[PDB]
DNA sequence: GCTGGCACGACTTTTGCACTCGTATATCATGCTGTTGCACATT
């Protein structure tokens, strides 16, 4: 909030938690071999 | 006859010369780059 926003927005600087997004058909697929890395690998065919 | 600005032979001044020895901080906010640590595929 405030405006250090109009100032944020402008600049397209990227948050602190981006939310990811996806493709075409996201089919159930979880995670393959979801090790101490970073896990549940979603890889929609 | 009286006087007042011009040149000459000593003196005096300048100049290249280039040559060596010789007290402090405490604004954050952001982006970029580099080093090191760690997970994953390989023979």
């Given at each position: 909030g405030g405006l250090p926003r109009v100032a944020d927005?402008?600049?397209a600087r990227r948050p602190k938690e981006p939310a990811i997004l996806a493709?075409?058909?996201?089919?159930?697929?979880f995670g393959?071999?979801?090790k101490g890395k970073r896990?549940?690998?979603?890889?929609?065919?």
């Open positions: 927005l402008f600049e493709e075409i058909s996201g089919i159930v697929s393959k071999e979801t896990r549940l690998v979603i890889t929609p065919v």
